[PDB]
RNA sequence: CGCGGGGUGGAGCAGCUGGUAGCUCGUCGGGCUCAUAACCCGAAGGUCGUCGGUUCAAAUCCGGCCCCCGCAACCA
RNA sequence: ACUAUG
RNA sequence: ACUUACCAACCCGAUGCAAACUGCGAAUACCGGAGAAUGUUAUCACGGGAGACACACGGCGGGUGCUAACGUCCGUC
RNA sequence: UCCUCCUAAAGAGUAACGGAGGAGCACGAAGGUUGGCUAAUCCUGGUCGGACAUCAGGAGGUUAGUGCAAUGGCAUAAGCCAGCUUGACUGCGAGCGUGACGGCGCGAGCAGGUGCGAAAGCAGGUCAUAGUGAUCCGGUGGUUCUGAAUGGAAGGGCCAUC
RNA sequence: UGCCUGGCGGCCGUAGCGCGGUGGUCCCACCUGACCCCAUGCCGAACUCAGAAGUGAAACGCCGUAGCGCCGAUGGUAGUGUGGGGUCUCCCCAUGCGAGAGUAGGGAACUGCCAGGCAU
RNA sequence: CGUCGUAGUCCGGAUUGGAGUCUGCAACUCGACUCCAUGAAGUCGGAAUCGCUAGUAAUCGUGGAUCAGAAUGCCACGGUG
C-alpha cells in the first residue's frame, strides 16, 4: 500500500531526471524479497525446522517452503533430501508491508547498528544481507524464543548495475552507510 | 536374492491365481491388487498368499 | 526462454502424434487480447476453415475479444463453417495451453454445434 | 582377472533396404537405440526394432531439425 | 627418457607402418632433420640423440623434437611356449614414415647445425637428411 | 615369476561386514623413598606401507608400485 | 600379608 | 601490506599420435529392382545312399610371436 | 553359462591360454497414464557457514542424468516432479527376424474385460542389450476328461504353479 | 497488385550466434487487477480468470554489417577393384573408381496455405 | 533493622580500558593508593600430604621494625572461641 503508492509518485519521476532514461518502463521495479533461515543442525531434530518455519511464518506472514539438500555432500554429514533450510518468496502486496516494516522498525532495532554495507550487491543489482536475530521483529515474542536464530534477506530487483541499485533502494530511505 | 515368491489369490473363489514376487523385509504389509479373473470374465481383487 | 517458445515445446509431442495418425486437427491459439483457430488438412500446411476475435463478422456482436464469452462465439463459429464443407472427425490440438476456462470453453461449443471430438 | 570373454553375436543391423519391397509386420532394422526412427507406416517395437505396418516399397530419408534418419514406406 | 604419463590402455596392436608422414614442414625452427626411410625410434634412441645434438652445439640455440614415442612394445621372457597371453610392456617408440622431421634447430649458423644432426644421425636406425625452412 | 598371506601410536598386537581406532608394554608429568627400582595418580601420542581409483564418505571395497614372509617351481 | 639395590 | 629470475589450470596460436577417439569418408563387397546376351536347369523343394568334421602351402587383410620360424589363430582367393 | 566393446577386413557371421570390463539381480513403484519441468560445473553477494552445505543472480549449454558393466540411444525427452491408478490383464495373432535342432526374439491387428485422458489416443511391465537351467521324479491348487464287472474312490490326464 | 503483423507448415546452419540500427493505427509483447473458474510442495513468478490506464525498455519481428560459425569447386595427393612387376615389414606399372584436409570462392536463406490491418 | 533466594548469582574478584592522587631529580622499563567502566578461573580439589591437647586450633581485626615511597612476608598485640 503505503511504500508502493510513494513508488509510483515519487520514485519513478526522480529516478527518470537522475539517469534519463527515455522511456519509463526502464526505472528499476522491485521484483521480490527473498527470507531464509539455513539451518543445518536437522540431523539433529526436525523440531529445530518447525520452530525455524513458524518464526519465517510470524515474520514474513505466510507459509514458508522447506528446502531438501540438492547434493549429499560429507563435511555436514547430510543425505540428498534431507530438510536443511527454510525459505519465503514475497511478491506484490506481502512484499512492501514486510519492506516497510524492514525500513520503518527492525532496521533501527539492530544493536550496534552502524548503517548497512553499500557494497553488498551481488553485480547485477541486488542486494542481500544478513541479520543476526530474529527478536528485532515485532512478532517474534521474545518471552517465547526456544533459540536466537539468524536470517537473510534478499531484495530482487530489475536493474542492470549496482548503481541503479543503489539508486533504487536509497530513494524509498533505506538505511546505508 | 533377498526377493521371495507368492500368490496373489482372486476373492470371486474360483482358486485361480497369478504369481510374482516381493521383498518381504522392505515391504511387510500385504500386496493387494485389482487383476482379470479368468474363470468369471471380470476384474476383481486379488490379495497375498504362500507359493 | 520466453513463453513462446516453451509452449511450442508443450505443444509438439501432441502434434507429432496427430501427424502419423493422419488426422484433420482443430488447432486452437490463446492471446491475452483475442482468440483464434483453425482446421488444418492432413498434410498440415492447407487450412481448411477458420474463426477468431479479430474477423469482424464475429467482433461487432461481442463485449470484449480475450474472454470465455467470446471463446464461446468462436468455437460455435468453426463448426458451422466445418460442416458447410463436410468435416465432422477433428482432433482438437490445445497447442500447449492448458484444457481449461477460455481454451475449453471454445472447445465445447464446438461439441455443442456438432463437430465431432 | 585375465581376459577370455566375450559374448554371442546379436545380429542386428539393416534387413531390408530402399527400393526391397515387404509386408505389413516385417522388421526392417533391428539395433540398440535409435541410429533410425520410424517414420509413415513404421512401428518401433520395445527393443526399438523397425516394423512394416503396411506393405509397400522402404524408403529412407533425413528429416526434421536435427537430421535424423528415418524409415518411412511408399504404399504401392 | 619419453614415455606418456598415463593411457587408456596398457597394451597396443602391433599394427603396419605404411604411407608418408604427416609433420613434413620445418615450422618451429630454421634447420631440420627429416626421415627418408620408415621404421621406429625407440625412447632410447630418441634421447641418445638428443644428448648428442645438445652436446655439440654448447648450448647455444633451441631444440625441439617432434616425435613421441607413444606405442608401446612387449616381448615375452625367455622361454615362454607360446601363449599364454600377450606379453609385458618393455619399451615404447614412435613409428617413423619417410619425410617426418624429427628435429628441429635455430639459434645456430649453418655450418654448425649440418655437424650437429650428423651426430645425431649415427644414433638413429633410419636414413635422413639435413633441410632447411622454406617460406612457402 | 605361478598361487596365497601381511605392512596400524616408539614395541608387539587387535579393528578390515564401508560412516565409531583399541589392548598390554614403553614415553611424559605428578607423588611415595635419604635416593633409585617396584608400587599409587594424571596426560599425551597412530600420514593405518605408497600412489591412484570408486563412493556424498575409504584403515576398511578395487587397481598399480615397494618391501616382507609362506607354498609351488614337476615327468623325462 | 609384607620384600630389591646403593 | 610489498617484490618473484620458481611450478603454471583455462583460454589463444602453431604441431603430431590412437584397435577399443570421429563435427569427415572411398574402393570393393552385400541387399533389392529392371534389361539384353550366354550357360546341357547351373536355382529351389521333396525323397534313397553317403563320405567328411587331422588339412597343407601360396597371394592379399589382420591377431599372436622378435612385422623370428616350412611357427600359430581368423578372414578371402 | 550369460552380457558389452575391440580384434572383425564400412551388411550378417568370423578364431586364439588375443586386448578390456560386467551378470547369476532389483522395483506395487523405479510399472501405466494425464499435466508440468530442464542439467553438470564455475563466478558475485549473503547470519552462524569454513574449498564443500539452504538463499539470490549471472555465465555455461547436457561437459548432466538414465537402479547396476560397456556400447548404442534419449529434449517430442527414454532425464526430473506432481495427480489418479494396476495393461507387471485373459484368450489370440497376419507377418518378420534368428538359430543344426531343442529353442529365442519382434509384432500391427481381433475378442473379452480394465486404467488414465475433455478428446485424438496410450497402456499385454521397466531406454535397449545380462540377471539363468532341458527331461525324468515328485509336491500344491483347480478341472465339461479318465476311472480295468457296475456306483463311487484311488491313481492317470489337462490347466495353473513349486 | 504493394507494405506490415499473427497462426500452421515445407526446408534444415548459404537458413545460425553475435554486433549495430529500427517498429506500436491494428497485431504482438510486456502491462492493470483478482472475491469468482483455476493455481503455488511458500509466492497471482508460472499456470488461470477479469480487464485495457501505461510502454515498446525487455521480449519478439524487420533492415544492415563478412567479427565467429556455416557451405565450398578445379587441380594435385592419399587410398583402392582387376591384371602384371619389384630391390617384396614396403612399393612400382596398365587400367577403372577416387577422398579427407586445404585453396579460390560463396554466403546476413529460400518457399507455401489461411487470417487480419494500412496504402491504391 | 532492612534486603538478596541457590543463580557462575547483589557469590568471586583476576584481567584490561579510561581518568586521577601522593612520595620522589625521576614512577617507560618497574611503586603504592583512589574513582568510572570491564567481571577470567573458580560450584570445596586425584595420588598423596601438613598443623594442633586450651584461652590451643579456627576465625576477627590492631601495631611495629626495615622505610622518601613500596607488606598477602616478618615480629608483636588483644577480640570471639
Redesign the interface.
Given at each position: 500500500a503505503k511504500l508502493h503508492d510513494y513508488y509510483k509518485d515519487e520514485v519513478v519521476k526522480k529516478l527518470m531526471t537522475e539517469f534519463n532514461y527515455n522511456s519509463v518502463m526502464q526505472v528499476p521495479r522491485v521484483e521480490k524479497i527473498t527470507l531464509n533461515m539455513g539451518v543445518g543442525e536437522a540431523i539433529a531434530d526436525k523440531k529445530l525446522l518447525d520452530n525455524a518455519a513458524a518464526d519465517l511464518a510470524a515474520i514474513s506472514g505466510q507459509k514458508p517452503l522447506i528446502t531438501k539438500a540438492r547434493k549429499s555432500v560429507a563435511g555436514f554429514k547430510i543425505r540428498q533430501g534431507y530438510p536443511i533450510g527454510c525459505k519465503v518468496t514475497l511478491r506484490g502486496e506481502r512484499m512492501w508491508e514486510f519492506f516497510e516494516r524492514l525500513i520503518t522498525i527492525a532496521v533501527p532495532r539492530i544493536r550496534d547498528f552502524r548503517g548497512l554495507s553499500a557494497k553488498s550487491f551481488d553485480g547485477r543489482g541486488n542486494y542481500s544481507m544478513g541479520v543476526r536475530e530474529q527478536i528485532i521483529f515485532p512478532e517474534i515474542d521474545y518471552d517465547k524464543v526456544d533459540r536466537v536464530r539468524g536470517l537473510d534477506i534478499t531484495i530482487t530487483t530489475t536493474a542492470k548495475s549496482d548503481e541503479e541499485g543503489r539508486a533504487l533502494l536509497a530513494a524509498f530511505d533505506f538505511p546505508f552507510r | 536374492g533377498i526377493r521371495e515368491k507368492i500368490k496373489l489369490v482372486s476373492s470371486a473363489g474360483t482358486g485361480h491365481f497369478y504369481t510374482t514376487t516381493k521383498n518381504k523385509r522392505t515391504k511387510p504389509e500385504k500386496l493387494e491388487l485389482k487383476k482379470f479373473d479368468p474363470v468369471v470374465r471380470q476384474h476383481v481383487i486379488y490379495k497375498e498368499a504362500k507359493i | 526462454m520466453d513463453k513462446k517458445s516453451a509452449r511450442i515445446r508443450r505443444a509438439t509431442r501432441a502434434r507429432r502424434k496427430l501427424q502419423?495418425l493422419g488426422a484433420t486437427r482443430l488447432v486452437v491459439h490463446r492471446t491475452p487480447r483475442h482468440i483464434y483457430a483453425q482446421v488444418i488438412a492432413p498434410n498440415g500446411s492447407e487450412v481448411l476453415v477458420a474463426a477468431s476475435t479479430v474477423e469482424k463478422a464475429i467482433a461487432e456482436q461481442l463485449k470484449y475479444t480475450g474472454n470465455k464469452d467470446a471463446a464461446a462465439a468462436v468455437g460455435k463459429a468453426v463448426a458451422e463453417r466445418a460442416l458447410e464443407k463436410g468435416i465432422k472427425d477433428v482432433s482438437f490440438d490445445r497447442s500447449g495451453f492448458q484444457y481449461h476456462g477460455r481454451v475449453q470453453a471454445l472447445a465445447d461449443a464446438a461439441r455443442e454445434a456438432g463437430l465431432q471430438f | 582377472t585375465?581376459?577370455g570373454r566375450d559374448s554371442e553375436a546379436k545380429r542386428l543391423g539393416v534387413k531390408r533396404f530402399g527400393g526391397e519391397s515387404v509386408l505389413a509386420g516385417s522388421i526392417i532394422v533391428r539395433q540398440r537405440g535409435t541410429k533410425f526412427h520410424a517414420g509413415?507406416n513404421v512401428g518401433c517395437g520395445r527393443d526399438h526394432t523397425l516394423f512394416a505396418k503396411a506393405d509397400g516399397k522402404v524408403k529412407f530419408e533425413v528429416k526434421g531439425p536435427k537430421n535424423r534418419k528415418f524409415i518411412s514406406i511408399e504404399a504401392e | 627418457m619419453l614415455q606418456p604419463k598415463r593411457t587408456k590402455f596398457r597394451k597396443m596392436h602391433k599394427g603396419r607402418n605404411r604411407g608418408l608422414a604427416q609433420g613434413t614442414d620445418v615450422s618451429f625452427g630454421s634447420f631440420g632433420l627429416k626421415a627418408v626411410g620408415r621404421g621406429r625410434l625407440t625412447a632410447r634412441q630418441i634421447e641418445a640423440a638428443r644428448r648428442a645434438m645438445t652436446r655439440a652445439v654448447k648450448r647455444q640455440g633451441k631444440i625441439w623434437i617432434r616425435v613421441f614415442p607413444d606405442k608401446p612394445i612387449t616381448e615375452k621372457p625367455l622361454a615362454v611356449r607360446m601363449g599364454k597371453?600377450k606379453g609385458n610392456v618393455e619399451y615404447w617408440v614412435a613409428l617413423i614414415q619417410p619425410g617426418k622431421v624429427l628435429y628441429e634447430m635455430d639459434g645456430v649458423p649453418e655450418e654448425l647445425a649440418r655437424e650437429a644432426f650428423k651426430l645425431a644421425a649415427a644414433k638413429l636406425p633410419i636414413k635422413t637428411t639435413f633441410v632447411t625452412k622454406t617460406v612457402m
Open positions: - | - | 502419423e | 585375465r581376459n509413415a | 597371453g
